[PDB]
Amino acid sequence: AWPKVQPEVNIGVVGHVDHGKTTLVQAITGIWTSKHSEELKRGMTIKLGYAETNIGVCESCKKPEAYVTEPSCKSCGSDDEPKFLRRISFIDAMATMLSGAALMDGAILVVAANEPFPQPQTREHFVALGIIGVKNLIIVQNKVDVVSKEEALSQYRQIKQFTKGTWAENVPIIPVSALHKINIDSLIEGIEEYIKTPYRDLSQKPVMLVIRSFDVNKPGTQFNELKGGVIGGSIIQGLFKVDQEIKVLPGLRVEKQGKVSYEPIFTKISSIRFGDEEFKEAKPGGLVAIGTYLDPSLTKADNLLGSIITLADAEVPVLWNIRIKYNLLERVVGAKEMLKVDPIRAKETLMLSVGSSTTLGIVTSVKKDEIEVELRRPVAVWSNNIRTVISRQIAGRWRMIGWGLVEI
Predict the structure, then answer these.
(1) What are the tr-type G domain coordinates in residue numbering?
(2) Is 58 flagged in the annotation as binding?
(3) Is residue 145 annotated as involved in ligand binding?
(4) DSSP-derived pairing of the beta strands 349-354 and 357-366
Protein backbone atom coordinates (compact mmCIF):
# COMPACT_ATOMS: atom_id res chain seq x y z
CA ALA A 1 0.00 0.00 0.00
CA TRP A 2 0.94 3.73 -0.25
CA PRO A 3 1.63 5.61 3.07
CA LYS A 4 -0.43 8.55 4.46
CA VAL A 5 2.04 11.29 4.88
CA GLN A 6 2.06 15.02 5.09
CA PRO A 7 3.16 16.94 2.04
CA GLU A 8 6.85 17.37 2.03
CA VAL A 9 7.07 20.26 -0.38
CA ASN A 10 5.05 23.32 -1.42
CA ILE A 11 5.01 24.31 -5.01
CA GLY A 12 3.71 27.64 -5.97
CA VAL A 13 1.93 27.93 -9.20
CA VAL A 14 1.71 31.46 -10.64
CA GLY A 15 0.18 32.31 -14.00
CA HIS A 16 -1.07 34.87 -16.49
CA VAL A 17 -3.99 32.68 -17.66
CA ASP A 18 -6.45 32.50 -14.83
CA HIS A 19 -8.31 29.40 -15.92
CA GLY A 20 -4.81 28.07 -16.12
CA LYS A 21 -3.29 27.62 -12.71
CA THR A 22 -6.34 26.06 -11.09
CA THR A 23 -6.95 23.71 -13.98
CA LEU A 24 -3.26 22.88 -13.80
CA VAL A 25 -3.42 21.84 -10.20
CA GLN A 26 -6.53 19.90 -11.11
CA ALA A 27 -4.71 18.24 -13.95
CA ILE A 28 -2.23 17.00 -11.41
CA THR A 29 -4.55 16.07 -8.59
CA GLY A 30 -7.68 15.17 -10.57
CA ILE A 31 -10.12 17.00 -8.35
CA TRP A 32 -11.96 20.38 -8.64
CA THR A 33 -10.42 22.88 -6.15
CA SER A 34 -12.53 26.10 -6.43
CA LYS A 35 -15.59 25.58 -4.24
CA HIS A 36 -14.60 22.65 -1.99
CA SER A 37 -18.01 21.62 -0.67
CA GLU A 38 -16.66 21.20 2.90
CA GLU A 39 -15.67 24.36 4.78
CA LEU A 40 -16.01 21.93 7.72
CA LYS A 41 -12.27 21.45 7.17
CA ARG A 42 -11.39 24.71 9.01
CA GLY A 43 -9.38 27.18 6.92
CA MET A 44 -5.98 26.99 5.27
CA THR A 45 -5.85 29.01 2.13
CA ILE A 46 -6.17 32.77 2.74
CA LYS A 47 -7.90 32.83 -0.60
CA LEU A 48 -5.02 30.91 -2.01
CA GLY A 49 -6.36 27.75 -3.66
CA TYR A 50 -4.58 24.78 -2.19
CA ALA A 51 -4.20 21.16 -3.19
CA GLU A 52 -2.25 18.07 -2.20
CA THR A 53 -1.50 14.95 -4.22
CA ASN A 54 0.60 11.82 -3.94
CA ILE A 55 3.24 11.22 -6.56
CA GLY A 56 4.50 7.76 -7.48
CA VAL A 57 6.12 5.90 -10.31
CA CYS A 58 5.76 2.57 -12.06
CA GLU A 59 9.44 1.60 -12.37
CA SER A 60 8.90 -0.80 -15.25
CA CYS A 61 6.83 1.56 -17.48
CA LYS A 62 8.28 4.12 -19.83
CA LYS A 63 8.70 7.54 -18.40
CA PRO A 64 6.94 9.91 -18.29
CA GLU A 65 3.72 7.85 -18.57
CA ALA A 66 5.05 5.72 -15.72
CA TYR A 67 4.28 8.55 -13.29
CA VAL A 68 1.00 8.29 -11.39
CA THR A 69 -0.66 10.29 -8.61
CA GLU A 70 -2.49 7.22 -7.39
CA PRO A 71 -1.37 3.73 -6.19
CA SER A 72 -2.30 1.86 -9.41
CA CYS A 73 -0.27 0.91 -12.45
CA LYS A 74 -3.17 -0.38 -14.50
CA SER A 75 -2.72 2.70 -16.61
CA CYS A 76 0.61 1.36 -17.89
CA GLY A 77 -0.63 -2.23 -18.01
CA SER A 78 0.46 -3.44 -14.57
CA ASP A 79 -1.61 -4.69 -11.60
CA ASP A 80 1.36 -3.79 -9.43
CA GLU A 81 1.56 -0.91 -7.03
CA PRO A 82 3.74 1.96 -8.22
CA LYS A 83 6.61 3.09 -6.03
CA PHE A 84 5.49 5.97 -3.82
CA LEU A 85 7.73 8.96 -4.27
CA ARG A 86 6.30 11.78 -2.20
CA ARG A 87 3.30 13.86 -1.37
CA ILE A 88 3.46 17.39 -2.70
CA SER A 89 1.27 20.43 -2.12
CA PHE A 90 0.38 23.30 -4.40
CA ILE A 91 -0.22 26.90 -3.68
CA ASP A 92 -2.43 28.63 -6.29
CA ALA A 93 -1.76 32.26 -7.22
CA MET A 94 0.08 42.64 -2.51
CA ALA A 95 0.76 41.46 1.08
CA THR A 96 -1.23 38.26 0.27
CA MET A 97 0.89 37.13 -2.73
CA LEU A 98 4.00 37.79 -0.58
CA SER A 99 2.55 35.61 2.13
CA GLY A 100 1.82 32.82 -0.39
CA ALA A 101 5.36 33.27 -1.73
CA ALA A 102 6.97 32.74 1.68
CA LEU A 103 5.77 29.10 1.51
CA MET A 104 6.80 27.90 -1.96
CA ASP A 105 9.61 25.43 -2.23
CA GLY A 106 9.47 25.81 -5.97
CA ALA A 107 7.32 27.26 -8.68
CA ILE A 108 5.69 26.73 -11.98
CA LEU A 109 5.36 29.71 -14.26
CA VAL A 110 2.54 29.11 -16.77
CA VAL A 111 2.46 30.74 -20.22
CA ALA A 112 -0.22 30.63 -22.83
CA ALA A 113 1.03 29.27 -26.12
CA ASN A 114 -1.56 31.27 -28.08
CA GLU A 115 -0.27 34.53 -26.77
CA PRO A 116 2.84 36.45 -27.64
CA PHE A 117 5.68 35.82 -25.27
CA PRO A 118 6.18 37.42 -22.94
CA GLN A 119 2.87 38.81 -21.79
CA PRO A 120 3.04 41.67 -19.24
CA GLN A 121 1.90 39.46 -16.40
CA THR A 122 4.48 36.90 -17.39
CA ARG A 123 7.41 39.26 -17.01
CA GLU A 124 5.97 40.67 -13.77
CA HIS A 125 5.64 37.11 -12.41
CA PHE A 126 9.21 36.29 -13.51
CA VAL A 127 10.68 39.31 -11.72
CA ALA A 128 8.61 38.46 -8.66
CA LEU A 129 10.01 34.94 -8.70
CA GLY A 130 13.53 36.30 -8.90
CA ILE A 131 12.95 38.63 -5.96
CA ILE A 132 11.52 36.00 -3.61
CA GLY A 133 14.39 33.53 -4.14
CA VAL A 134 12.34 30.68 -5.47
CA LYS A 135 14.76 29.36 -8.02
CA ASN A 136 13.33 25.88 -8.38
CA LEU A 137 11.32 26.77 -11.50
CA ILE A 138 9.43 25.08 -14.29
CA ILE A 139 7.90 26.90 -17.11
CA VAL A 140 4.77 25.37 -18.41
CA GLN A 141 3.55 26.11 -21.93
CA ASN A 142 -0.17 25.67 -21.35
CA LYS A 143 -2.85 25.36 -24.03
CA VAL A 144 -0.30 24.04 -26.52
CA ASP A 145 -3.17 22.07 -28.15
CA VAL A 146 -4.71 25.25 -29.57
CA VAL A 147 -1.52 26.19 -31.51
CA SER A 148 0.53 24.10 -33.92
CA LYS A 149 3.72 22.18 -33.09
CA GLU A 150 5.56 24.86 -34.95
CA GLU A 151 4.06 27.77 -33.04
CA ALA A 152 4.76 26.07 -29.72
CA LEU A 153 8.33 25.32 -30.72
CA SER A 154 8.86 28.94 -31.86
CA GLN A 155 7.63 30.26 -28.55
CA TYR A 156 9.75 27.62 -26.75
CA ARG A 157 12.86 29.03 -28.45
CA GLN A 158 11.78 32.60 -27.59
CA ILE A 159 11.45 31.68 -23.97
CA LYS A 160 14.83 29.90 -23.95
CA GLN A 161 16.45 32.89 -25.67
CA PHE A 162 14.83 35.11 -23.08
CA THR A 163 16.22 32.98 -20.28
CA LYS A 164 19.64 32.56 -21.92
CA GLY A 165 21.08 35.64 -20.28
CA THR A 166 19.36 35.18 -16.92
CA TRP A 167 19.49 32.85 -13.94
CA ALA A 168 16.62 30.93 -15.52
CA GLU A 169 18.72 29.90 -18.51
CA ASN A 170 18.27 26.25 -17.80
CA VAL A 171 14.73 26.20 -16.43
CA PRO A 172 12.86 23.50 -18.32
CA ILE A 173 9.89 24.36 -20.50
CA ILE A 174 7.03 21.91 -20.48
CA PRO A 175 4.12 22.15 -22.93
CA VAL A 176 0.74 21.00 -21.60
CA SER A 177 -2.95 21.47 -21.94
CA ALA A 178 -4.40 21.81 -18.53
CA LEU A 179 -7.94 21.87 -19.75
CA HIS A 180 -7.79 18.78 -22.04
CA LYS A 181 -5.02 16.98 -20.13
CA ILE A 182 -2.19 16.64 -22.66
CA ASN A 183 1.34 15.60 -21.73
CA ILE A 184 0.63 15.96 -18.01
CA ASP A 185 2.89 13.01 -17.11
CA SER A 186 5.84 14.98 -18.51
CA LEU A 187 5.13 17.82 -16.08
CA ILE A 188 4.99 15.48 -13.15
CA GLU A 189 8.33 14.15 -14.27
CA GLY A 190 9.57 17.76 -14.47
CA ILE A 191 8.38 18.48 -10.97
CA GLU A 192 10.34 15.39 -9.86
CA GLU A 193 13.57 16.38 -11.62
CA TYR A 194 13.54 20.15 -11.18
CA ILE A 195 11.59 20.88 -7.97
CA LYS A 196 13.28 18.46 -5.64
CA THR A 197 12.39 18.24 -1.98
CA PRO A 198 14.80 20.56 -0.10
CA TYR A 199 17.14 19.44 2.66
CA ARG A 200 15.61 19.21 6.10
CA ASP A 201 17.55 19.44 9.31
CA LEU A 202 14.95 18.13 11.68
CA SER A 203 17.09 19.04 14.67
CA GLN A 204 16.57 22.76 13.85
CA LYS A 205 14.18 24.79 16.08
CA PRO A 206 10.56 24.43 15.05
CA VAL A 207 9.30 27.47 13.16
CA MET A 208 5.93 27.88 11.61
CA LEU A 209 4.80 30.73 9.46
CA VAL A 210 1.24 31.67 10.34
CA ILE A 211 -0.91 32.61 7.39
CA ARG A 212 -4.48 32.21 8.73
CA SER A 213 -6.39 32.07 11.98
CA PHE A 214 -10.00 31.34 12.53
CA ASP A 215 -12.57 30.73 15.16
CA VAL A 216 -13.87 27.35 14.00
CA ASN A 217 -16.61 27.21 16.64
CA LYS A 218 -19.87 27.40 14.78
CA PRO A 219 -22.82 29.56 15.81
CA GLY A 220 -24.93 27.83 18.40
CA THR A 221 -21.87 26.10 19.84
CA GLN A 222 -22.45 25.27 23.51
CA PHE A 223 -19.95 27.04 25.69
CA ASN A 224 -18.60 23.89 27.36
CA GLU A 225 -17.89 22.23 24.00
CA LEU A 226 -15.81 25.16 22.74
CA LYS A 227 -12.50 24.40 21.06
CA GLY A 228 -9.57 26.76 21.47
CA GLY A 229 -8.52 29.11 18.70
CA VAL A 230 -6.93 27.62 15.63
CA ILE A 231 -3.86 28.81 13.87
CA GLY A 232 -3.17 27.78 10.33
CA GLY A 233 0.18 28.22 8.71
CA SER A 234 3.18 26.68 7.05
CA ILE A 235 6.04 25.12 8.94
CA ILE A 236 9.22 26.37 7.51
CA GLN A 237 11.63 24.47 9.68
CA GLY A 238 11.94 21.84 12.37
CA LEU A 239 8.88 20.02 13.56
CA PHE A 240 6.04 20.50 15.96
CA LYS A 241 4.23 17.95 18.13
CA VAL A 242 0.95 18.05 19.97
CA ASP A 243 1.26 19.33 23.57
CA GLN A 244 4.49 21.18 22.81
CA GLU A 245 4.50 24.61 24.45
CA ILE A 246 4.67 27.24 21.77
CA LYS A 247 4.38 30.96 21.38
CA VAL A 248 3.04 33.41 18.85
CA LEU A 249 5.19 36.32 17.90
CA PRO A 250 5.10 39.25 18.08
CA GLY A 251 2.02 38.09 19.95
CA LEU A 252 -0.66 40.19 21.52
CA ARG A 253 -0.77 43.91 20.98
CA VAL A 254 -1.21 45.31 24.42
CA GLU A 255 -2.17 48.85 25.29
CA LYS A 256 -1.62 49.90 28.87
CA GLN A 257 -3.09 53.37 29.27
CA GLY A 258 -1.05 55.60 26.94
CA LYS A 259 1.30 52.73 25.97
CA VAL A 260 1.63 50.09 23.20
CA SER A 261 3.67 46.84 23.04
CA TYR A 262 3.49 43.24 21.92
CA GLU A 263 3.62 40.39 24.27
CA PRO A 264 4.17 36.88 22.92
CA ILE A 265 1.21 34.62 23.13
CA PHE A 266 1.84 31.34 24.86
CA THR A 267 -0.28 28.32 24.19
CA LYS A 268 -0.05 24.57 23.57
CA ILE A 269 -0.72 22.51 20.42
CA SER A 270 -3.88 20.47 20.73
CA SER A 271 -3.97 19.05 17.24
CA ILE A 272 -2.13 18.98 13.91
CA ARG A 273 -3.96 18.59 10.61
CA PHE A 274 -3.19 18.42 6.88
CA GLY A 275 -6.42 18.65 4.89
CA ASP A 276 -8.79 16.23 6.53
CA GLU A 277 -6.03 13.99 7.93
CA GLU A 278 -4.85 14.29 11.56
CA PHE A 279 -1.18 13.86 12.48
CA LYS A 280 0.96 13.36 15.48
CA GLU A 281 3.68 15.68 14.26
CA ALA A 282 4.07 18.39 11.65
CA LYS A 283 7.08 19.07 9.44
CA PRO A 284 7.82 21.56 6.62
CA GLY A 285 5.64 21.21 3.55
CA GLY A 286 1.91 21.56 2.96
CA LEU A 287 -0.48 23.77 4.83
CA VAL A 288 -1.01 22.75 8.42
CA ALA A 289 -3.83 23.43 10.85
CA ILE A 290 -2.71 23.88 14.38
CA GLY A 291 -5.15 23.63 17.20
CA THR A 292 -4.40 25.77 20.22
CA TYR A 293 -5.82 26.46 23.70
CA LEU A 294 -6.26 30.08 22.67
CA ASP A 295 -9.21 32.30 23.29
CA PRO A 296 -10.82 32.29 19.85
CA SER A 297 -11.10 36.06 20.06
CA LEU A 298 -7.34 35.96 19.50
CA THR A 299 -7.57 33.97 16.29
CA LYS A 300 -11.01 35.11 15.11
CA ALA A 301 -10.87 36.41 11.58
CA ASP A 302 -7.14 36.14 10.84
CA ASN A 303 -6.17 38.29 13.81
CA LEU A 304 -2.84 36.47 13.89
CA LEU A 305 -2.06 36.59 10.22
CA GLY A 306 1.65 37.31 9.66
CA SER A 307 2.77 35.95 12.97
CA ILE A 308 5.14 33.13 13.46
CA ILE A 309 4.94 30.29 15.91
CA THR A 310 7.94 28.82 17.70
CA LEU A 311 8.47 26.71 20.74
CA ALA A 312 7.77 28.59 24.00
CA ASP A 313 11.47 28.58 25.04
CA ALA A 314 12.76 29.61 21.65
CA GLU A 315 14.98 32.65 21.60
CA VAL A 316 13.73 34.92 18.88
CA PRO A 317 14.42 38.67 18.65
CA VAL A 318 11.39 40.80 18.03
CA LEU A 319 12.68 43.98 16.42
CA TRP A 320 11.29 47.43 15.63
CA ASN A 321 14.47 48.38 13.95
CA ILE A 322 16.26 46.24 11.44
CA ARG A 323 19.33 46.27 9.29
CA ILE A 324 18.98 44.83 5.79
CA LYS A 325 21.77 44.01 3.34
CA TYR A 326 19.92 44.79 0.21
CA ASN A 327 20.01 44.59 -3.57
CA LEU A 328 17.71 46.64 -5.81
CA LEU A 329 16.48 45.83 -9.29
CA GLU A 330 17.86 47.84 -12.18
CA ARG A 331 14.28 48.57 -13.25
CA VAL A 332 10.61 47.84 -12.70
CA VAL A 333 7.86 46.37 -14.82
CA GLY A 334 5.22 48.94 -15.60
CA ALA A 335 2.11 49.39 -17.71
CA LYS A 336 3.87 51.26 -20.47
CA GLU A 337 7.55 51.22 -19.66
CA MET A 338 10.38 49.86 -17.60
CA LEU A 339 10.93 52.23 -14.76
CA LYS A 340 14.18 53.36 -13.31
CA VAL A 341 14.69 52.34 -9.68
CA ASP A 342 15.85 55.22 -7.51
CA PRO A 343 18.31 54.22 -4.72
CA ILE A 344 16.90 53.99 -1.22
CA ARG A 345 16.50 57.38 0.43
CA ALA A 346 16.35 58.32 4.12
CA LYS A 347 12.94 59.22 5.70
CA GLU A 348 11.11 57.45 2.92
CA THR A 349 8.62 54.69 3.81
CA LEU A 350 9.15 51.09 2.56
CA MET A 351 7.20 47.88 2.90
CA LEU A 352 9.05 44.87 4.18
CA SER A 353 7.85 41.33 3.83
CA VAL A 354 9.36 38.91 6.19
CA GLY A 355 8.07 35.40 6.05
CA SER A 356 4.29 35.61 6.11
CA SER A 357 4.43 39.10 7.57
CA THR A 358 4.24 42.47 5.89
CA THR A 359 5.05 45.66 7.77
CA LEU A 360 5.46 49.31 6.97
CA GLY A 361 8.69 51.03 7.97
CA ILE A 362 10.54 54.38 7.81
CA VAL A 363 14.12 54.33 6.48
CA THR A 364 16.39 55.62 9.24
CA SER A 365 19.69 54.83 7.57
CA VAL A 366 20.99 54.34 4.05
CA LYS A 367 24.28 52.81 2.90
CA LYS A 368 25.20 51.08 -0.37
CA ASP A 369 24.75 47.51 0.85
CA GLU A 370 22.85 48.19 4.02
CA ILE A 371 19.85 50.08 5.36
CA GLU A 372 18.32 50.51 8.79
CA VAL A 373 14.60 50.76 9.20
CA GLU A 374 12.16 51.78 11.90
CA LEU A 375 9.15 49.58 11.84
CA ARG A 376 5.58 50.60 12.45
CA ARG A 377 5.15 47.10 13.75
CA PRO A 378 7.76 44.69 15.04
CA VAL A 379 9.00 41.56 13.33
CA ALA A 380 9.94 38.20 14.79
CA VAL A 381 13.37 37.33 13.39
CA TRP A 382 13.82 33.62 13.90
CA SER A 383 17.17 33.25 12.10
CA ASN A 384 20.06 35.26 10.78
CA ASN A 385 19.92 36.32 7.17
CA ILE A 386 16.22 35.99 6.88
CA ARG A 387 15.11 37.17 3.45
CA THR A 388 13.07 40.34 3.18
CA VAL A 389 11.22 41.87 0.29
CA ILE A 390 11.56 45.58 -0.05
CA SER A 391 8.75 47.51 -1.64
CA ARG A 392 8.08 51.09 -2.61
CA GLN A 393 4.84 52.89 -3.46
CA ILE A 394 5.33 53.95 -7.01
CA ALA A 395 2.58 55.49 -9.16
CA GLY A 396 0.23 54.99 -6.26
CA ARG A 397 0.86 51.28 -6.27
CA TRP A 398 3.12 49.20 -4.09
CA ARG A 399 5.84 47.51 -6.12
CA MET A 400 8.62 45.14 -5.16
CA ILE A 401 11.86 47.05 -5.71
CA GLY A 402 14.44 44.66 -4.26
CA TRP A 403 15.34 42.18 -1.58
CA GLY A 404 17.65 41.79 1.33
CA LEU A 405 18.76 39.92 4.39
CA VAL A 406 18.04 41.09 7.87
CA GLU A 407 21.35 41.10 9.68
CA ILE A 408 21.69 40.35 13.38
Answers:
(1) 6-199
(2) yes
(3) yes
(4) antiparallel
